[PDB]
Amino acid sequence: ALHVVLYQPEIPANTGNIARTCAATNTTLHLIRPLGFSTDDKMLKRAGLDYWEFVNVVYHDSLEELFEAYKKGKFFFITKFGQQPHTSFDYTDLDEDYFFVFGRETSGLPKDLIQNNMDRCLRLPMTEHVRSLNLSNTAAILVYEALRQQNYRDLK
Amino acid sequence: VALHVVLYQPEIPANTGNIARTCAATNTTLHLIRPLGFSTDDKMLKRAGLDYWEFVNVVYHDSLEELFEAYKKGKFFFITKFGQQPHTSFDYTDLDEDYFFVFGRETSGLPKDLIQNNMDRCLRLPMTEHVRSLNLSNTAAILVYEALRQQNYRDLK
RNA sequence: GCCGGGGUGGUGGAAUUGGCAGACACACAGGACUAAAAUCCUGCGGUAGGUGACUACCGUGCCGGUUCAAGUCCGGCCCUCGGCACCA
Ligand SMILES: Nc1ncnc2c1ncn2[C@@H]1O[C@H](C[C@@H](N)CC[C@H](N)C(=O)O)[C@@H](O)[C@H]1O
Structure with a gap:
């Protein structure tokens, strides 16, 4: 019911961690295929540990292919630019498919x-000491914020 | 009156580095219970490219009881998979109390x-069933921003 | 001065009465693992033929000798440490 989109990820370990977080929440992971790593990067495998078999990972050769394929979706875009926090x-509509899309790490x-x-652009309120926040952490804050709103349904 | 993230004997280096990133992006004081599984020497801090450590405000503690007796009136929430209550x-919200979030060991x-x-203050992030545990980094960040959601992102741009 | 130890890969270092030199540990390198500076598995003296299987070759401070065979025994020398002596 929940979805995570990764637009051309660079760091394999970042993506592997997100895959584990997906398996812990039964979330679909979407990947825009101009990736910065291979499907056989061992750091990718390590960061996902053994939870890879519980992740439904979908590859999309472009951002367009994804949008059209999932025509009924609430696509939420997560950048520094959005003027509204993610919360x-x-x-809260459980009869829907929610899509959180994450940009390239650099x-x-x-x-x-x-x-x-820009109305669907979520900026995670930070300080100025760092420019950004780790993708694998940033992905998790949103899954478990949306899961709070959906009251962690079926998840115990 | 701020948030406090304390890590009980962290081991894997990358997890603590990402937690310090979140701690610097939230001005959350990072408490570190030794023995740590890595080295926080400035040489090794710069070998991992941790340039935000200066802004993290790290308070090293040598025992969990030392931390309890230095911050006696802290609201200590222990975060483990064995809790029955969510983190939410x-x-x-109380900006007069010091909230402390205690995290565990990766192995x-x-x-x-x-x-x-x-067990009253034992929070479990609801997982599936086939997943044994979450990342220490992810678990810490989720909790920091849920408290900041309740605190309406105080002085956070 | 005498006597007695030590010298061996990248490092500390092992090798029994002479009979496969480099055990073991660290480093390094490649992997595995329930995001590693954790742990576990593997490779690791040199040379060249080598895809490789691996092969032969060389290698224990220098130079000798005894041996079928020398890290090992013998003689000279270099470096080093210790006891003893040596000190107007
Ligand atoms: N589902 C979870 N709920 C709450 N904290 C968690 C969760 N998964 C991991 N953590 C945190 O990460 C630590 C270590 C775990 N990742 C490892 C498994 C360990 N047996 C445990 O107590 O969860 C925990 O002690 C918490 O600090």
Whole structure:
């Protein structure tokens, strides 16, 4: 019911951790195929430990292919640019598929896409001591915020 | 009046580095219960590229009891998979109290007897069933931002 | 000065009465593992033929000798440590 999209990830271990977090929440992981690693990177495998068999991982050769395939979806885009924190939105409809899309670790999301949908742009309130926050951590804050709103349904 | 993340004998280096990242992005004081499984020497801190350590405000403690007796009136929430309550069932809004979030060991976990005595404040992030545990990094960050959700991201841009 | 130890890979270092030199540990390297500076598995003296299987070759401070065979025994020398002597 929940989805995590990774636009061309770079760090294998970051993605592997997110896969484990997905298996702990029964979340679908989406990957935009211009990846910075291979499918056989051993750091990818390690970060996912043994939980890989419980992750439904979907590959998409482009951001477009994903959007069209999941035409009925609440696509939430997570960048520094959004003027609204992630907790100011609503994820409480359980009859829906919620999509959280994460940019490249050293780039962002496509600047065209951010322009068109700034109402769905979630910025995690930080300080100035760091420029960003680890993707695998940032992915988890949103899954367990949305899971709070859905009252961790079926999850004990 | 801020949040406090204390890590009981952390071992895997990368987890603690990512926790310090979140701690610097939230101005959350990081308490470190020794023995640690790594080295926080400035040489090794810079070998891992941890340039935010200066802003993390790390308070090394040598025992869990030392930490309890230095911050006696801290609200100590112990975070383990053996809790029965979520992390969102408690109130971290009081800006007059010091809230402390205790995390465990990546290969072992929090002291079992400490969990038994204080099951009232034992928080379990709801997982599936086939997943034994979450990442220490992820578990810490989730808790920091849930308290900041309740604290409306005080002085956070 | 005498006597007695030590010298051996990248490192500390092992090798019994002469009979496969480098055990073992650290380093390193490749992996595995219930995000490793944890742990576990594997490789590791050199050379060249080598895809490799591996092979032969060389290698214990220098130079000798005894041996079928010398890290090992013998003689000279270099370096080093210790006891003893040596000190107007
Ligand atoms: N589901 C979870 N709920 C709460 N804390 C967790 C969870 N998974 C991991 N943690 C944190 O990470 C620590 C270590 C675990 N990752 C490892 C398994 C260990 N047996 C345990 O006590 O959970 C825990 O002691 C917590 O600090």
